[PDB]
Design a protein around this nucleic acid. Structure first.
Ligand code: SF4
Ligand SMILES: [Mg+2]
Ligand SMILES: [Zn+2]
Ligand SMILES: [Zn+2]
Ligand SMILES: [Zn+2]
Lengths: 166, 86, 46, 459, 58, 443, 130, 43
DNA sequence: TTCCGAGATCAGACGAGAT
DNA sequence: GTCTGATCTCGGAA
């Protein structure tokens, strides 16, 4: 997890002029940047605070109010030094699929580095033996638009020993 | 209509072509030096480095590079064998 | 193979047919000519 | 899973007028137009094949969609095609600048004939923090002053002369040298990028090598549904220049159809150096500037004969019923006109205080309120959505008497729906319009947005 | 009318992405009269190229 | 000359870096520009511009001089930057004319730009001893012997006196005892010496073996007494020709005297003006021979015979049919070799005139082919720029399946076919550029 | 008058004594033949079935003035009416060669970057690299 | 010339369809709703 | 000696709108 | 079918 300072031009429609701005911008910005990975940034989640909100213009068209909003939002972005704890929501013969608990089932570990009893043989064998720990290793995101996924990870499992569970 | 069929051609093939890799024998000498200095000009002091990579990296941590007989005798001769101008 | 091109009367108000003539032109091709009455009492604007 | 995507429109900051080099003309176009001098219409059911109307280019009719989009004629833009001219030819738009550059650059080394001081004197002028069009076009005089006095360069020492503009679109340089556009292309290739800003061509917009045409963008089909006929006349001549080279003919005719292609490329731009060109679509009181960008035709606007009515206040125009049932104002539904618009949408487009279109809250097509149940549309009417109610009394229309001579010829008026087909106003306000009632007509526009309604009423 | 141009190399690119520099990322819609769009597209037909440089609404 | 600037963007990108190219290539595009103005227009921070100009003044690509404002305007000479392309060829002729020691002398002089004697002899005492036998150490005294031996034939000239302006800083340019004085290489002497190989190969492959050697010994004894701006060599007598002959020859004086008046009277004509003027047309003729066959090359030599006599004789003087000939003229016209119809004197009429006559102009066909050869090496390097970044996975595996290795030997066949072909078009540049410099006054 | 003729059949026949060149030794001046070339032109060349057995110097010299443009000897003393010095010498090529595959293509000259004819993927260098 | 014109006046803002800055488009309008640059949270 | 004044020829334009 | 500034050619002079 990491804070990301962001700047957005948030448009409040004119039937919300009863509510306070810093709340009613926050209700919009959650609908703008939740469950959405930003390229080279990470998976945005929610709104931390609005650090600076500047003055509400109203443009010659819409009649709405457009406030340029500086804020900070918490995002999900592993730092290439994190030993996370997830769950195996799937097993493919090329590599296991781990999922952080109801977070994102999009972390796909390749499996080449654990102890020399390694295969997934399509009958859902986890590992040939001697919560699940994970080492997130690389950042890898692909911008989708191409014509008229997207944070995938590669996840390792070294000689941790795993004293509690094998 | 006589040409209204398709892009003239994907490519136009010239019936005569290039001769060879002309001057074949002796440019083995220059040709290795083409690749020799390019091995040494890139690995030189007279180059620049991507310090924009390090300002891009907020993941700085310890244990990574991001964190970390001439046998001769004295003499002195200064010659003006060269020009005395400019 | 027949697409009908119906000759409709646009107008704004209604019009009564008075005569309908049927003839051949020079290159004999069945010309048909209508004639639309309309009476207007002179109201505001005329 | 979802990755963030932004969906926001923007506005114009500036326009940087430039050219495209003929390598940029090719990779801004979707098809080659090497095809026939015929119109691509085939013998049976006249379809289009490769031609000059490929349909990946654009769309001329509602039934045929274009090919490089899926969209039809309605909401598809144009797409570009390009033709390859065999022999390069002068662009008649930039032709005065080609003589303007060939008078400045050397005709042997393609450097500008100046010292290293005068060059540095003028380049000191060009890096001024304040630069105007006046401070540019003033220099192009002065740099062409000092360069059309010299005869020997400083950079090659060869001898130059005058560039005299012989005849129609031809160049003579002092049995004197003639600069056809074949030799001009590589001379403009050898101008250094040092000397590109000294001819005042901002090289971010375009270098001098593309003042002459070796490729040519054909306009999209959606902006020509007679200029197509000038395009196929090129590709006919682009084969006649292609056939006679491999056929064997004396150069006084291969230099003639090159001349004939030079005019035909120039005739497609300007036609008064019969069929109008790209100049004549931007000219006079008929072109796009003076008549389609400024003086453009306008929806929600009517025109009748005027007759007096002293029994109105000076601020009111009597609007006929039949006009007021046609001209509509989109009044959005806003908790105060909900019962009023419900009351009038039951009337529909036959009783006058009524409506004839409803958009739903989300761009649903206007629902022509004639066929369906109006009471089912009345009860289902919610907040937010648009009703195009009739021109009712208390609405703001604005007059105009068509020879507008001063500010007072357009004036707003409140609108009261009377019973006749004349625009009736109070006769005190007739000397601003300069309007007598001897059969004079005057127009009535109806502003649609609520911001343009207040700008009529107050101002 | 409603038209789509791109930020860099600013030129009329159809729908979601601009054909010159296929990279699809900078393309941002404008709002313009159609007669002005027909001006740009017949200016660009001859060699005058109006290269729009957009800016967001401030 | 935009394709020239295409190469200077390519040549600095492969050698030093990218911002030293960018600040470099911008300076070629906007010229005499101060330090703050360069950093504002390229969008580069001022600390990196001071470093990038520091490397550029070291390798003598950017020259600085202030005139009036008291603010130094840097300026990059364009034609020096393309001489990096000839760099391994500059190494090789110091191996044919000097030993492996002096060949390494011009190498690290070309590599590190400005060098003092106290450094460059100290460096080759490292490189030549580490490749020779330990205990059989190469003595540095022979290096100092061959170091001056290069300078007496004037292959290495010294740097012009430094301006030492206040804006310029002395400490940054040297890379870290005695100070000494710096020099670059005299690559201008090479352009004589590369021309010396050019004329001696022009005679030997045309006239006879014994004709070329007396041209060589004429030019070998006229080296210091001329310069590159000499319109022709210094005049010599035939008696010192017999003195300056090599010891391999045994020819009597009077028979070579007959060959001396034979060699003086040719269509070729030592006239250094006519020598590069005749060698450039053979470079033109070897391009139409490369491209349009011997039939179109036959009419290409015909217009070099008669200046303005064309299309009423070219169907007759080569006997090839009118259909086959006239496509060769218009292909020589459309590719700008045939130049144009500069004789039409009837007024403003393409149809009715005094009949347009073709005429080759030797320099317009020269400057185009030089611009073409500048364009050519752009397509060479960019391919070798292309094939490099993919195959990096298997270069370090040696440091591997059967298609994995097979991609490498098809890469190394390709790169060595590209890099050898950068030099074979490079010899066309100098052979034509020296012709360009020979017809350019006031430069 | 003889437009129905292929002098490209006769260009080798006026070439092959100038390729062999017995006595390339430099014992003397080697002032070389043009009259014997007119002599071999009149009576008999290398064998060929020829309709124009009539021998005029005005119809036979023209094959030379093509072959000078095919790199063969210049004229020395043709100012004489029939017989003078007439020096000649077959010119061997004064250079090597100078081109490459990319020097051959006219249409491929257009490109300037990765575009529709970009040199990062051209067919011609792909053909040349095998 | 590489003429970069800004879009000002009225003969260009009418062509481009921008609200002209002469007259009613000179100033611009704000909204007076409840807002403040607030304090953040302690992290 | 060159340069600037004064002789010729050349441009784009010549209101709204309406049926 | 002129009214127009611009831009080209001649010519007499310090
Ligand atoms: S490679 Fe690039 S340059 Fe060489 S031919 Fe193909 S396109 Fe022309
Ligand atoms: Mg009247
Ligand atoms: Zn489309
Ligand atoms: Zn010159
Ligand atoms: Zn784009």
């Amino acid at each position: 997890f990491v804070l990301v300072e962001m700047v957005d031009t948030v448009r409040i429609p004119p039937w919300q002029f009863e509510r306070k701005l810093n709340d009613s911008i926050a209700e919009e910005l959650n609908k703008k940047l939740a469950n959405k990975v930003v390229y080279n940034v990470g998976l945005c989640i929610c709104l931390f605070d609005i650090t600076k909100l500047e003055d509400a213009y109203v443009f010659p068209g819409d009649g709405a109010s457009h406030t340029k909003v500086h804020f900070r939002c918490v995002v999900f972005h592993p730092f290439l030094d994190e030993i996370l704890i997830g769950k195996i929501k799937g097993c493919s013969p090329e590599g296991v699929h781990v999922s952080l608990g109801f977070f994102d089932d999009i972390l796909i570990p390749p499996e080449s580095l654990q102890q020399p009893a390694k295969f997934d043989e399509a009958e859902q064998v986890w590992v040939w033996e001697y919560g699940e720990e994970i080492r997130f290793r690389v950042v890898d995101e692909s911008f989708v638009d191409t014509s008229p996924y997207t944070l995938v990870g590669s996840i390792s499992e070294p000689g941790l020993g795993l004293l509690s569970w094998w | 209509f006589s040409k209204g069929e398709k892009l003239p051609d994907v490519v136009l093939k010239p019936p005569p072509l290039f001769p060879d890799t002309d001057y074949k024998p002796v440019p083995l000498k220059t040709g290795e030096g083409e690749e020799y200095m390019l091995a040494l000009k890139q690995e030189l002091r007279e180059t620049m480095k991507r310090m924009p990579y390090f300002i891009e990296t907020p993941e700085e941590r310890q244990d990574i590079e991001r964190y970390s007989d001439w046998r001769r005798l004295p003499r002195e001769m200064m010659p003006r064998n060269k020009c005395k101008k400019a | 193979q027949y697409k009908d091109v119906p000759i409709t009367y646009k107008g704004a108000t209604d019009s009564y047919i008075e005569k309908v003539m049927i003839s051949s032109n020079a290159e004999d091709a069945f010309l048909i000519k209508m004639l639309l009455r309309q009476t207007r009492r002179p109201e505001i604007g005329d | 899973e979802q990755f963030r995507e932004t969906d926001v429109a923007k506005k114009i900051s500036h326009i940087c007028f430039g050219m495209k080099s003929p390598e940029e003309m090719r990779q801004q176009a979707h098809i080659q137009v090497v095809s026939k001098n015929l119109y691509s219409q085939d013998n049976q059911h006249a379809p289009l094949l490769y031609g000059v109307l490929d349909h990946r280019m654009g769309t001329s009719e509602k039934d045929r969609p274009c090919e490089t989009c899926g969209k039809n004629l309605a909401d598809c833009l144009g797409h570009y095609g390009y033709i390859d001219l065999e022999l390069p030819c002068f662009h008649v738009g930039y032709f005065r600048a080609v003589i303007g550059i060939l008078q400045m650059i050397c005709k042997t080394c393609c450097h500008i004939m100046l010292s290293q001081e005068e060059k540095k004197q003028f380049l000191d002028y060009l890096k001024r923090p304040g630069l105007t069009y006046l401070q540019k076009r003033g220099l192009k005089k002065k740099i062409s002053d000092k360069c059309r006095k010299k005869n020997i360069c400083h950079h090659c020492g060869a001898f130059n002369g005058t560039v005299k503009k012989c005849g129609l679109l031809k160049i003579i340089h002092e049995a004197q040298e003639n600069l056809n556009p074949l030799v001009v292309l590589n001379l403009f290739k050898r101008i250094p990028a040092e000397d590109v800003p000294l001819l005042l061509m901002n090289p971010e917009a375009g270098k001098p090598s593309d003042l002459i045409l070796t490729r040519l963008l054909v306009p999209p089909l959606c902006i020509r549904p007679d200029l197509t006929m000038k395009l196929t006349e090129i590709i006919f001549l682009n084969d006649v220049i292609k056939k006679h080279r491999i056929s064997g003919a004396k150069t006084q005719m291969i230099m003639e159809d090159w001349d004939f292609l030079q005019l035909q490329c120039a005739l497609y731009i300007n036609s008064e150096l019969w069929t109008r060109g790209f100049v004549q679509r931007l000219k006079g009181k008929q072109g796009r500037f003076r008549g389609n960008l400024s003086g453009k035709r306008v929806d929600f606007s009517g025109r009748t004969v005027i007759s007096p009515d002293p029994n109105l206040r000076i601020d009111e125009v009597a609007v006929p019923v039949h006009v007021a049932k046609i001209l509509t104002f989109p009044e959005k539904v806003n908790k105060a006109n909900i019962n009023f618009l419900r009351k009038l949408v039951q009337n529909g487009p036959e009783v006058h205080p009524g409506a004839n279109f409803i958009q739903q809250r989300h761009t649903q097509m206007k629902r022509f309120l004639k066929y369906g149940n109006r009471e089912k549309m009345a009860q289902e009417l919610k907040y937010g959505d648009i009703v195009e109610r009739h021109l009712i009394d208390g609405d703001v229309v604005l007059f105009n008497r068509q020879p507008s001579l001063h500010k007072l010829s357009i004036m707003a008026h409140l609108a009261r729906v009377k019973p006749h087909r004349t625009f009736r106003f109070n006769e005190c306000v007739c000397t601003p319009y300069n309007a007598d009632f001897d059969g004079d007509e005057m127009n009535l526009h109806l502003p649609q947005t609520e911001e343009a309604k207040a700008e009529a009423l107050v101002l | 009318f409603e038209v789509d141009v791109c930020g860099q190399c600013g030129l009329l690119g159809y729908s979601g992405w601009c054909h010159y520099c296929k990279s699809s990322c900078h393309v941002s819609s404008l709002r313009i009269p159609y007669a002005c769009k027909l001006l740009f597209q017949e200016l660009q037909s001859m060699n005058i190229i109006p290269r729009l440089k957009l800016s967001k609404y401030n | 000359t935009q394709a020239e600037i295409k190469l200077c963007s390519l040549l600095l990108q492969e050698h030093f870096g990218e911002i030293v190219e960018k600040i470099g290539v911008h300076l070629i595009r906007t010229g005499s520009q101060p330090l703050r103005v360069i950093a504002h227009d390229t969008g580069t921070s001022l600390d990196q511009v001071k470093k990038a100009l520091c490397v550029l003044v070291q390798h003598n690509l950017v020259s600085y001089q202030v005139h009036k404002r008291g603010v130094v305007e840097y300026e990059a000479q364009c034609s020096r930057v393309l001489r990096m392309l000839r760099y391994p060829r500059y190494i090789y002729t110091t191996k044919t004319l000097y030993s492996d020691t002096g060949e390494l002398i011009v190498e690290e002089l070309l590599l590190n730009g400005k060098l003092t004697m106290s450094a460059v002899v100290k460096k080759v005492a490292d490189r030549l001893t580490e490749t020779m036998e330990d205990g059989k150490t190469m003595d540095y005294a022979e290096v100092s012997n061959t170091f001056v031996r290069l300078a007496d034939t004037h292959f290495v000239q010294r740097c012009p006196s430094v301006p030492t302006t206040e804006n310029s800083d002395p400490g940054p340019p040297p890379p870290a005892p005695d100070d000494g004085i710096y020099w670059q290489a005299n690559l201008d002497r090479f352009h004589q010496h590369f021309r010396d190989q050019a004329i001696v190969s022009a005679v030997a492959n045309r006239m006879d073996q014994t004709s070329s050697e007396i041209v060589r010994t004429m030019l070998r004894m006229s080296e210091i007494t001329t310069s590159s701006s000499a319109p022709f060599t210094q005049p010599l007598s035939s008696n010192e020709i017999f003195r300056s002959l090599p010891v391999g020859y045994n020819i009597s004086k009077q028979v070579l005297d007959q060959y001396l008046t034979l060699l003086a009277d040719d269509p070729l004509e030592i006239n250094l003006h006519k020598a590069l003027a005749s060698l450039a047309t053979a470079t033109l003729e070897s391009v139409v021979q490369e491209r349009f066959g011997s039939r179109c090359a036959r009419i290409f030599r015909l217009v070099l015979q008669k200046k303005h006599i064309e299309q009423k004789q070219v169907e007759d003087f080569a006997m090839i049919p009118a259909k086959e000939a006239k496509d060769m003229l218009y292909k020589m016209l459309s590719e700008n070799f045939m130049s144009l119809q500069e004789i039409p004197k009837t007024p403003d009429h393409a149809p009715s005139r005094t009949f347009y006559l073709y005429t080759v102009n030797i320099l317009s066909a020269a400057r185009m082919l030089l611009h073409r050869c500048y364009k050519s090496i752009a397509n060479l390097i960019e391919r070798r720029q292309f094939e490099t970044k993919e195959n990096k996975r298997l270069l370090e595996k040696s440091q591997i399946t059967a298609p994995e290795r097979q991609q490498l030997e098809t890469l190394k066949r390709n790169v060595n076919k590209l890099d050898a072909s950068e030099i074979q078009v490079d010899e066309t540049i100098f052979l034509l550029e020296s012709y360009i410099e020979c017809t350019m006054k006031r430069q | 008058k003889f437009l129905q003729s292929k002098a490209e059949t006769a260009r080798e026949s006026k070439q092959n004594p100038m390729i062999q060149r017995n006595s390339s030794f430099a014992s003397s001046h080697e002032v070389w033949k043009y009259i014997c070339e007119l002599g071999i032109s009149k009576v008999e060349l290398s064998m060929e079935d020829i309709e124009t057995i009539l021998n005029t110097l005005i119809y036979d010299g023209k094959v030379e003035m093509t072959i000078i443009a095919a790199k063969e000897g210049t004229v020395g003393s043709v100012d004489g009416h029939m017989k003078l010095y007439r020096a000649v010498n077959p010119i061997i090529p004064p250079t090597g060669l100078v081109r490459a595959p990319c020097g051959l293509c006219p249409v491929f000259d257009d490109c300037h970057e990765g575009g529709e004819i970009s040199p990062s993927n051209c067919i011609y260098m792909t053909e040349w690299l095998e | 010339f590489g003429q970069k014109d800004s879009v000002c006046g009225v003969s260009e803002c009418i062509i481009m369809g921008i609200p002209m800055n002469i007259g009613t488009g000179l100033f611009k309008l704000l909204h007076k709703a409840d807002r403040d640059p607030n304090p953040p949270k302690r992290p």
